Design a protein around this ligand. Structure first.
Ligand SMILES: *[C@@H]1O[C@H](CO)[C@@H](O[C@@H]2O[C@H](CO)[C@@H](O[C@@H]3O[C@H](CO)[C@@H](O)[C@H](O)[C@@H]3O)[C@H](O)[C@H]2NC(C)=O)[C@H](O)[C@H]1NC(C)=O
Length: 493
């Protein structure tokens, strides 16, 4: 349990770093590597445990595996539409549009939500690696996450003195070497049978009532429109010189997302359909014990033979550990650099980068660990990340680039309106009891009060409308008399 897991993880991390430096030492092909790396930005750590939750958990099923189909569609929406109206106007990074119209100050107030979103994502990755380690070396839930994240952040500490391709290859080989074998286990029954007929559990094929179809469309639109905005995607496409190449790149990344989601769904489906009274895990099921998180590492380690298991499971753990470094470094660096330049001015010569990035990266890792420690879901963290991004960033991104005449008053008005309409409406994974109680709430765990009336999409739309309304109203009273131009907090005249 302990020794085999530790040696497997160490060996595979050594081998992945070795291949990385083999690359870093030293056409007809350029569609391959770019598409694979840009889909490697999303896939990895996230999907496998997230969609494992989505499929395995009773009641939700496939029809509630929103993100594994949500993001791919998100990629197409980002490319097929926003590929054009940023090339022609010309922009270097997504930092630029906000700091071009909204002065310079407004940008940091806008990009704090991006920090919190990628903080959610980093917490999800840390939770996934904690579960994988807690299965491979079978220690604990508190111990695995803290050990994992401390090592990850202290390695990213001196990580400053391509590898994203080998991540996907390891992920693909690891899943596609276990599932053909686990599906053969006598403990498992026909994956088709429990899909439609519900022999040993509710059908792992998701079921949605006509009543909460509004909530289903809320979640779908949230994920689909909250994937586009984020920084890594814009940074990648903007660094691509030719436009059509970006469209084919979006096609290929969405296809990579969808193909890598195929082995991940079947893993959770087997985990659900399996008769657990035969395996050596004990009759207490992953739901009847508060450990539904670990369903994928559990099905790999226990429902596969000893020799096959460590290849795939160590590959998964090593890949997600590697992704942790990139996510942590990028998330801390962008905030520190942008907002520190923002505040009044600060010498970047020989203090800012090292000192500020150090402080921010350490505290960011600590906070990601702290919130990944209490939430026993990863699908929930995803939802929360894309949820906040959808609430705040996307409306103003869409009005800045697709709409004309947007101004700085609209930025603050949309910010306040969106944030209020979201936080006041309640959040069910944490204990955010709502204050409004939109028609359609159902009694639950007193932490979960879902309103079938979509308020997330309503908040997004009304924040965009608030931006437009206050912007053009202030533009209309631009004048003397009508709050004369003497009164001017953020410049528009
Ligand atoms: C899986 O579940 C089954 C049943 O849900 C468990 O198997 C049963 O275990 C008992 C205890 O050894 C076996 O003895 C039986 O006990 C009852 C108690 O009332 C008695 O009336 C019977 O005459 C008999 O002595 C029982 O035969 C056995 N049933 C079967 C079908 O094997 C089992 O412990 C669970 N876990 C596994 C199989 O890992």
């Amino acid at each position: 349990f302990h020794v085999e897991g530790l040696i497997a993880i160490i060996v595979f991390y050594l081998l992945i770093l070795l291949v990385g430096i083999w690359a870093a030492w030293r056409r007809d092909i350029g569609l391959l590597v770019g598409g694979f790396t840009m889909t490697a930005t999303w896939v990895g750590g996230g999907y496998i445990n997230g969609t494992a939750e989505a499929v395995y958990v009773p009641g939700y099923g496939l029809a509630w595996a929103q993100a594994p189909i949500g993001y791919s569609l998100s990629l197409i929406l980002g490319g097929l539409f926003f590929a054009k109206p940023m090339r022609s106007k010309g922009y270097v990074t997504m930092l630029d549009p906000f700091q071009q119209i909204y002065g310079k100050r407004m940008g940091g107030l806008l990009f704090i939500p991006a920090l919190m979103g990628e903080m959610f994502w980093a917490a999800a990755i840390f939770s996934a690696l904690g579960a994988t380690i807690s299965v491979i070396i079978d220690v604990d839930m508190h111990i695995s996450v803290i050990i994992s994240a401390l090592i990850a952040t202290l390695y990213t500490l001196v990580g400053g003195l391509y590898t994203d391709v080998v991540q996907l290859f390891c992920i693909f080989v690891g899943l596609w070497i276990s599932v053909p074998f686990a599906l053969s286990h006598p403990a498992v029954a026909d994956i088709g049978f429990t899909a439609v007929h519900a022999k040993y559990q509710k059908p792992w094929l998701g079921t949605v009532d006509s009543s909460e179809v509004y909530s289903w469309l809320d979640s779908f639109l949230l994920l689909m429109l909250g994937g586009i905005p984020w920084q890594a995607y814009f940074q990648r496409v903007l660094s691509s010189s030719s436009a059509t190449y970006a469209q084919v790149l979006s096609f290929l990344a969405a296809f990579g997302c969808l193909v890598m989601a195929i082995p991940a769904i079947l893993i959770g489906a087997i985990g659900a359909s399996t008769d657990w009274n035969q395996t050596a895990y004990g009759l207490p099921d992953p739901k009847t014990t508060e450990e539904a998180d670990m369903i994928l590492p559990i099905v790999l380690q226990y429902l596969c033979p000893v020799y096959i298991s460590f290849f795939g499971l160590g590959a998964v753990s090593a890949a997600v550990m590697s992704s942790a470094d990139s996510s942590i470094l990028s998330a801390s660096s962008m905030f520190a650099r942008n907002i520190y330049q923002l505040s009044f001015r600060q010498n970047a010569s020989d203090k800012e980068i090292v000192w500020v990035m150090r402080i921010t990266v350490f505290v960011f890792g600590a906070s990601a660990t702290a919130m990944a420690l209490l939430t026993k879901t990863v699908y929930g963290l995803w939802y929360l990340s894309s949820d906040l991004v959808y609430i705040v960033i996307f409306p103003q991104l869409l009005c800045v680039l697709f709409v004309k005449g947007t101004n700085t008053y609209g930025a603050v008005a949309g910010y306040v309106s969106g944030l209020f309409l979201r936080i006041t409406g309640g959040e069910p994974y944490l204990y955010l009891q709502p204050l409004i109680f939109y028609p359609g709430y159902y009694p639950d765990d007193n932490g979960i009060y879902n309103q079938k009336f979509p308020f997330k999409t309503l908040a997004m739309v009304t924040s965009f409308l608030t931006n437009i309304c206050i912007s053009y109203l202030a533009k209309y009273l631009f004048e003397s008399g009508t709050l004369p131009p003497k009164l001017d907090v953020f410049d528009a005249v």
